Short mmCIF file of N, CA, C and O in Angstrom, two decimals:
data_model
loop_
_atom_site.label_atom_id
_atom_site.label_comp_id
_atom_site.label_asym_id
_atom_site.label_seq_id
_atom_site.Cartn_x
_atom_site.Cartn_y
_atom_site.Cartn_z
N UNK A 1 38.04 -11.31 7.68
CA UNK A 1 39.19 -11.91 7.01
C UNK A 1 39.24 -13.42 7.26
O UNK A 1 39.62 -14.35 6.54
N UNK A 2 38.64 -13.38 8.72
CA UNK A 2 38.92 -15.37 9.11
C UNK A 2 37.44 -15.94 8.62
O UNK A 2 37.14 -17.13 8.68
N UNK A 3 36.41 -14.73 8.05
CA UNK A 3 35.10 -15.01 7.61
C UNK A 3 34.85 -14.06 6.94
O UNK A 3 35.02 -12.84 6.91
N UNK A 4 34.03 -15.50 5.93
CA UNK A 4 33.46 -14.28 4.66
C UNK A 4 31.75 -15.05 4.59
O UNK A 4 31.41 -16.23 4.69
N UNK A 5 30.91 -13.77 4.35
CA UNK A 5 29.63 -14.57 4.07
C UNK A 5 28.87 -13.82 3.02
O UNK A 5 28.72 -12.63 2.75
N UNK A 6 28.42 -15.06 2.50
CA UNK A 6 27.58 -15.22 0.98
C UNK A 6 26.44 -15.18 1.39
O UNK A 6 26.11 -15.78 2.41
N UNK A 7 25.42 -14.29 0.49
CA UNK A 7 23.93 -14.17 0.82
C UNK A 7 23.38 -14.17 -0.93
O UNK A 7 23.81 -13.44 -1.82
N UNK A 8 22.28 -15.25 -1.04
CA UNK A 8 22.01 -14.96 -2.34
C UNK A 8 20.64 -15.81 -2.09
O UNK A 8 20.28 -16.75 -1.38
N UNK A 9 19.97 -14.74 -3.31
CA UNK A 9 18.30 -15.30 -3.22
C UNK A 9 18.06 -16.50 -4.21
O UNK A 9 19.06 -16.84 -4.85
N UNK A 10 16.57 -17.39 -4.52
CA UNK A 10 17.18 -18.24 -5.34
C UNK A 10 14.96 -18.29 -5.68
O UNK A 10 14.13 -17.79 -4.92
N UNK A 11 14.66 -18.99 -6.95
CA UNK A 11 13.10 -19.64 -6.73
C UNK A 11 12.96 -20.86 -6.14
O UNK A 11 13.57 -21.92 -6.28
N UNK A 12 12.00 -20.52 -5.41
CA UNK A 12 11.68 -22.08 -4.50
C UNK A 12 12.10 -23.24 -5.54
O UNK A 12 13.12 -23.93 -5.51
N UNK A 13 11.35 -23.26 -6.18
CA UNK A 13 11.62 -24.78 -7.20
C UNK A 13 13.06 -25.20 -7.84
O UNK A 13 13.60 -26.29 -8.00
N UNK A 14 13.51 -23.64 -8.18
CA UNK A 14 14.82 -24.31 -8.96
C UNK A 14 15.75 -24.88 -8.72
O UNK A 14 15.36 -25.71 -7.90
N UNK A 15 16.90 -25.05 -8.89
CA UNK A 15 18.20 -26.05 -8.05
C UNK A 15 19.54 -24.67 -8.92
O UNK A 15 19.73 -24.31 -10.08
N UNK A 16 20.11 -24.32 -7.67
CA UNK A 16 21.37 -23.53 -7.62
C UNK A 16 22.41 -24.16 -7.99
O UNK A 16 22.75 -25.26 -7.56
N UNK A 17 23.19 -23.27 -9.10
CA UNK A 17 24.37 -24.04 -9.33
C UNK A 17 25.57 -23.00 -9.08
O UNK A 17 25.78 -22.12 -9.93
N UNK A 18 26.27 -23.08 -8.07
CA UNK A 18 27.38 -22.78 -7.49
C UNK A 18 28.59 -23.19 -7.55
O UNK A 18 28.81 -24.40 -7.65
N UNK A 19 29.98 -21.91 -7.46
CA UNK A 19 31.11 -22.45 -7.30
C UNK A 19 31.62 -22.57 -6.25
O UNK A 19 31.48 -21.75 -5.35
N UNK A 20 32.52 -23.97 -6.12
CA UNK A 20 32.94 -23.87 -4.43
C UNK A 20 33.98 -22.57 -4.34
O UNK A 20 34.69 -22.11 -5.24
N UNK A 21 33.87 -22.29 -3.44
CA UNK A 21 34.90 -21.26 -3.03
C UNK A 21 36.39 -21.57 -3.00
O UNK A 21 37.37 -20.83 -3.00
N UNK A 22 36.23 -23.06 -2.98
CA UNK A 22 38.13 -23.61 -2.51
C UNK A 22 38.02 -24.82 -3.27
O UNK A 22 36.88 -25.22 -3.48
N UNK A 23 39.17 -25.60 -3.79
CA UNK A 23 39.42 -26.34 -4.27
C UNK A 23 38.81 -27.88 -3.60
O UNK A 23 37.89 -28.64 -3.91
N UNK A 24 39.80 -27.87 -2.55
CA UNK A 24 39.77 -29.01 -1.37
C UNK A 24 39.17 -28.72 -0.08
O UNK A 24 39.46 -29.68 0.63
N UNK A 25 38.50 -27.90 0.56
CA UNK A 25 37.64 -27.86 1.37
C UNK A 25 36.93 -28.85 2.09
O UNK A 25 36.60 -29.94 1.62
N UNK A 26 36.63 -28.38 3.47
CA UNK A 26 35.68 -29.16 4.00
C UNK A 26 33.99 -28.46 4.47
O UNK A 26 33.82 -27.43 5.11
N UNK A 27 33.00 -29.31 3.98
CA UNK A 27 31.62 -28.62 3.70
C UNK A 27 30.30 -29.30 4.76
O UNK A 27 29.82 -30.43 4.80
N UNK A 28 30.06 -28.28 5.42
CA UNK A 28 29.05 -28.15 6.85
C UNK A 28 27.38 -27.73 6.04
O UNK A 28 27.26 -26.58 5.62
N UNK A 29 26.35 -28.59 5.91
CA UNK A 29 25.35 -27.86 5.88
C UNK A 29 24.15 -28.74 5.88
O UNK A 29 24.39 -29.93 5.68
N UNK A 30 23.06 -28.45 6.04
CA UNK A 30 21.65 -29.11 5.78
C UNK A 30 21.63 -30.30 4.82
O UNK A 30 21.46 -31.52 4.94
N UNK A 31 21.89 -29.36 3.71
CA UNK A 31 21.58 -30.34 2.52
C UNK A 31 23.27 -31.16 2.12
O UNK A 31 24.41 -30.74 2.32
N UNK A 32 22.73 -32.54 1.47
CA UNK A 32 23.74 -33.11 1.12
C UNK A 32 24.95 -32.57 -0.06
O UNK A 32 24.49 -32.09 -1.10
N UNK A 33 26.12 -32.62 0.06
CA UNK A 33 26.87 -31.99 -0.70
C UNK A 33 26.44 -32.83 -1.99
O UNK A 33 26.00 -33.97 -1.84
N UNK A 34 26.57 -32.24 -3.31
CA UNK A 34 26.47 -32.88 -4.22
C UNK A 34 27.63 -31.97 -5.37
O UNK A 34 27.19 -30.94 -5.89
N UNK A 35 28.84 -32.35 -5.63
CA UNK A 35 29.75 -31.60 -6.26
C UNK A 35 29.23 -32.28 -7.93
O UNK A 35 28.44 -33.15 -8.30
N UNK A 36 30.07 -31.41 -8.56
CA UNK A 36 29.51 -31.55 -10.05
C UNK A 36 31.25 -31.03 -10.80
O UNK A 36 32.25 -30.73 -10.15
N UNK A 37 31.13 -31.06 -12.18
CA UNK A 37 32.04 -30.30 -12.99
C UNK A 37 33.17 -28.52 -12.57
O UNK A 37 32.97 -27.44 -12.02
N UNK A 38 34.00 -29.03 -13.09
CA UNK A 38 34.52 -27.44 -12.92
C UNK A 38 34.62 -26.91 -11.70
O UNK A 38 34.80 -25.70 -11.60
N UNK A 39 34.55 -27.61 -10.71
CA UNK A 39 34.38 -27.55 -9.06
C UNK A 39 33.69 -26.57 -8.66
O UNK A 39 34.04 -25.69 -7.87
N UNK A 40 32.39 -26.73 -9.37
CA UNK A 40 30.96 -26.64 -8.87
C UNK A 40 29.83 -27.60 -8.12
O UNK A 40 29.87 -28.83 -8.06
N UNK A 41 28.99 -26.87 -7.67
CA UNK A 41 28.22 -27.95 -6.51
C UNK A 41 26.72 -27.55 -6.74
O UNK A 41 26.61 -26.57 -7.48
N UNK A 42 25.55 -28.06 -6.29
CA UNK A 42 24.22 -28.35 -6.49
C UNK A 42 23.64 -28.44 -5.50
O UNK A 42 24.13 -29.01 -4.52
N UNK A 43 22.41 -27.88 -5.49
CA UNK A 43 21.44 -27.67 -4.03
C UNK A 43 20.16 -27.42 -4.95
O UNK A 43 20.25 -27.09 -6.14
N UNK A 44 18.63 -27.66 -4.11
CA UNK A 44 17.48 -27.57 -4.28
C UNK A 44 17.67 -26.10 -3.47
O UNK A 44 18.46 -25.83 -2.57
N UNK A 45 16.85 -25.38 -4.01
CA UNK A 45 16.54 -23.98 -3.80
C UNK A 45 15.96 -24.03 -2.08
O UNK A 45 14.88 -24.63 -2.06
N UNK A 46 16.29 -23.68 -1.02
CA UNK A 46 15.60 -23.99 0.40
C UNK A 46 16.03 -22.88 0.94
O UNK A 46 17.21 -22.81 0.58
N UNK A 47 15.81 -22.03 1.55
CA UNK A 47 16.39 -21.32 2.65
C UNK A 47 16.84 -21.90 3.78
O UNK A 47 16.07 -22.36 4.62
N UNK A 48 18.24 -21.93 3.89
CA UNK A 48 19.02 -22.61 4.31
C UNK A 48 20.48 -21.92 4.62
O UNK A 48 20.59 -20.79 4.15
N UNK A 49 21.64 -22.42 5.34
CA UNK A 49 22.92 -22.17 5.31
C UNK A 49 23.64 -23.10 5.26
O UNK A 49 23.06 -24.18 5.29
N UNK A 50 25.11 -23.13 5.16
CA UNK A 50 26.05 -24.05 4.79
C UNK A 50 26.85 -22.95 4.85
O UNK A 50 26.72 -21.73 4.72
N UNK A 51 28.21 -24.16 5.22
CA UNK A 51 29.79 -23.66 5.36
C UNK A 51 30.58 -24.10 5.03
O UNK A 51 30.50 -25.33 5.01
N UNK A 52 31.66 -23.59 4.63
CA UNK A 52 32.89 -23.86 3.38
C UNK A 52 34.17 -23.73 4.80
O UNK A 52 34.32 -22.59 5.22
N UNK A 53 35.06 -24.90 5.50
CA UNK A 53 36.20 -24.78 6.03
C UNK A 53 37.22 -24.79 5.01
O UNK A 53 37.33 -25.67 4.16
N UNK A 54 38.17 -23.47 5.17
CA UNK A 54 39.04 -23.29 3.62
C UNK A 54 40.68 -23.73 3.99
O UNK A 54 41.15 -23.49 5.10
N UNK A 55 41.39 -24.32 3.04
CA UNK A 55 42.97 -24.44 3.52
C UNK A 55 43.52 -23.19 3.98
O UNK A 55 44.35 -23.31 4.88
N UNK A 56 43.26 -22.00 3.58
CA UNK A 56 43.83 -20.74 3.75
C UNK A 56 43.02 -20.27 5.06
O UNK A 56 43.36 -19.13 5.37
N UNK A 57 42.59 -20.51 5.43
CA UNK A 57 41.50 -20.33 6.88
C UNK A 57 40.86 -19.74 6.96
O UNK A 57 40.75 -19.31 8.11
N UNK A 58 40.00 -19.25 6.07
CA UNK A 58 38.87 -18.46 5.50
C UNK A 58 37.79 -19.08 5.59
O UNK A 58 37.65 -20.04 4.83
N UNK A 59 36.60 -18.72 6.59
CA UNK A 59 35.77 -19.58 6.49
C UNK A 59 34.38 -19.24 5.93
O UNK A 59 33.82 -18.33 6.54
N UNK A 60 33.71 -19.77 4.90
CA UNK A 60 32.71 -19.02 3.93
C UNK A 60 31.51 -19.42 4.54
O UNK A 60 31.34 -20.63 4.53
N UNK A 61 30.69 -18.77 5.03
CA UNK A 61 29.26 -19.30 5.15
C UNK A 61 28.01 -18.58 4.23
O UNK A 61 27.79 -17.37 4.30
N UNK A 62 27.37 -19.32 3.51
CA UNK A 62 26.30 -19.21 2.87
C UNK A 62 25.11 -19.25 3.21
O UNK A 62 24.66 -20.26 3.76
N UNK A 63 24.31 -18.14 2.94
CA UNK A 63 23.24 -18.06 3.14
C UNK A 63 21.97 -17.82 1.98
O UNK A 63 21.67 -16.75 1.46
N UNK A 64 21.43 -18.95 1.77
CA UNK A 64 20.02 -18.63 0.69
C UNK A 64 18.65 -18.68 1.40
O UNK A 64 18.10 -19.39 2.24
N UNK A 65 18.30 -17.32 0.49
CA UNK A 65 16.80 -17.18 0.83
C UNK A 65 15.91 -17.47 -0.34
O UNK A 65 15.98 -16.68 -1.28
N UNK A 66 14.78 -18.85 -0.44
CA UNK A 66 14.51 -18.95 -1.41
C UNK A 66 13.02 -18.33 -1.18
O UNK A 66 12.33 -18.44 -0.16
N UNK A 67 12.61 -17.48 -2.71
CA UNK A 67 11.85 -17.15 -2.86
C UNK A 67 10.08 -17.72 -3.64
O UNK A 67 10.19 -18.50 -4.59
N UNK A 68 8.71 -17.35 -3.25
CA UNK A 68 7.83 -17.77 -4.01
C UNK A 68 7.72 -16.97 -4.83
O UNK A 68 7.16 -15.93 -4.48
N UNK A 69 8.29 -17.09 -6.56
CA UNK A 69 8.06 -16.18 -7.49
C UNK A 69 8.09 -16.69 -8.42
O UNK A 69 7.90 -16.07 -9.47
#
């Protein structure tokens, strides 16, 4: 409930396009945040994690596994 976690596969090459989970958030991860439209965000495909601190105190962590396919 105080955590929720996201697991999603992705191709090495492509670039993920994701919704943030929260409006106004604060965002923990490897790669640089890069927000976009419609309060969506952008990443190069890496196996990697990142974390979403939420106003409601929900805290989202993501996990991608990118694949050679």
């Amino acid at each position: 409930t105080c955590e929720l976690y996201h697991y999603q596969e992705c191709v090495r090459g492509t670039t993920v396009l994701l919704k943030e989970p929260c409006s106004s958030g604060t965002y923990e991860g490897n790669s640089p945040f890069h927000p976009l439209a419609d309060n969506k965000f952008a990443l190069t495909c890496f196996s990697t994690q990142f974390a979403f601190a939420c106003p409601d105190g929900v805290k989202h962590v993501y996990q991608l596994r990118a694949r050679s396919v």
